[PDB]
Amino acid sequence: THQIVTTQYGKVKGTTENGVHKWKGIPYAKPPVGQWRFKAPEPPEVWEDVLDATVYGPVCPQPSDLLSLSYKELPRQSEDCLYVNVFAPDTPSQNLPVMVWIHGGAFYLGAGSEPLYDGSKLAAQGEVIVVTLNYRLGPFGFMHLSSFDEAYSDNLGLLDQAAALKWVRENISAFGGDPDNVTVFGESAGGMSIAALLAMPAAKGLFQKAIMESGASRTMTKEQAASTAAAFLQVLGINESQLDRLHTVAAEDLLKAADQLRIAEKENIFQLFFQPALDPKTLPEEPEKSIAEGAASGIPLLIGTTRDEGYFFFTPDSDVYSQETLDAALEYLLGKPLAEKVADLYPRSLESQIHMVTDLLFWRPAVAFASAQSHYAPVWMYRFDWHPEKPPYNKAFHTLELPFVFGNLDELERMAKAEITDEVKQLSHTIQSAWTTFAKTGNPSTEAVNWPAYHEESRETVILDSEITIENDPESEKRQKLF
Ligand SMILES: [Ca+2]
């Protein structure tokens, strides 16, 4: 019971708290620092001593937008951030299902070790193993320089994720898990990453089930990636023959360059500058397209969105984008033809701006992904409607279902100043129960909810809220409009 586990790279020593074995800060790759910056993740150097796995590793460098809110104590940052954490219920039973979390944060923020993602409650209550992890963010993970050198790899953050999943397949049995029953789950950028992992050749067979919360197919073209890379190099004063400084410049300077780039190219929510990109060697094509071809055949999918996603990105006092920028967004998201047809739906205003986020950045991609996958595997869809009744947090906004999934309800205080009522504890119980039953069986049905299979003929959807309900082909009008 002293919890020493041998990984393929060396022994790690965990701890046991309240019936949950925990190992924090386990290296799964070589620190992508200096000369290893912008390169695919490599195995970490082996160690023959006994690594103390009781403290979280550093988080990837990022502006403090999210850290200063998610932590009461700002965590240490460093490009040396590739670590995984394992939470396992103290049970005699071995080969427990494994749930691997990929955190969100629009590809430039977050960490697997945010308090919100502590997997103790989820592990104990669902009797599954929970794995959390960090992957390169912003310019460290979603700055694609392949066009400047075949030695560099694009979609680094996604390759990091794939490497962590490979680590799980190769090592989790040692922690009491079943490497053949791995469920990957994530929200926001994590859901979008899972969309990509489902379509990435180098991720084949790394997981058997998937949960995509508020996030589906999301990529920029190969052309845009090259365009943004050149623009980025300029801000750094680096050119085709000075690619040396890329491996010597301080990480802190890469973050500044990124923010300047953000400002220079006037980045807006509809087209993030750092996100996955098409690339023959890593992400051959749009996830949605690959899935429609059956690339994820046989893999059960639990997918959904929150009813009021957009209200998380804009406050009542937020500036309203110009027509010029709005048209450019609609056109980029739906294409010239559909953009014009739907222009009607979004007449300039804060309202339309927000509805554009919910509808085009989350709902439409979700329905498109669920619909496509329904021809090759079981699909289960939901819409999260819960929210405090009284203002100003009376909207089912992006991120709000997270405390319920993980059961860390204290987070609801900072997220929506909501108290933990029996109503809240009950919704969390139903959600955790469905998520863990799905990880165990590939079907999220539980005594609390009999989840109907989602297919294009009826599009039955489960509505998560104080009272569970089922809607058939929700928002039919809009769907028919957007499709
Ligand atoms: Ca022991």
Swiss-Prot record:
Entries under SUPFAM superfamilies matching the protein: alpha/beta-Hydrolases
Function recorded in the entry: Catalyzes hydrolysis of several beta-lactam antibiotic PNB esters to the corresponding free acid and PNB alcohol.
Top-level EC class as recorded in UniProt: hydrolase
Domain of life: Bacteria
Organism phylogeny: Bacteria, Bacillati, Bacillota, Bacilli, Bacillales
InterPro entries found in the cross-reference section: AB_hydrolase_fold (IPR029058), CarbesteraseB (IPR002018), Carboxylesterase_B_AS (IPR019826), Carboxylesterase_B_CS (IPR019819), Cholinesterase (IPR000997), Type-B_Carboxylest/Lipase (IPR050309)
E.C. numbers: 3.1.1.-
Coiled coil: none
Modified residues (Phosphoserine): 188
Family per record: Belongs to the type-B carboxylesterase/lipase family.
Effect listed in the UniProt record for changing residue 342 to A: In strain: NRRL B8079
Oligomeric and partner information: Monomer.
Active site residues according to the UniProt entry: 188, 309, 398
CDD domains: Esterase_lipase
UniProt-recorded name of the protein: Para-nitrobenzyl esterase
Classification via Pfam families: COesterase
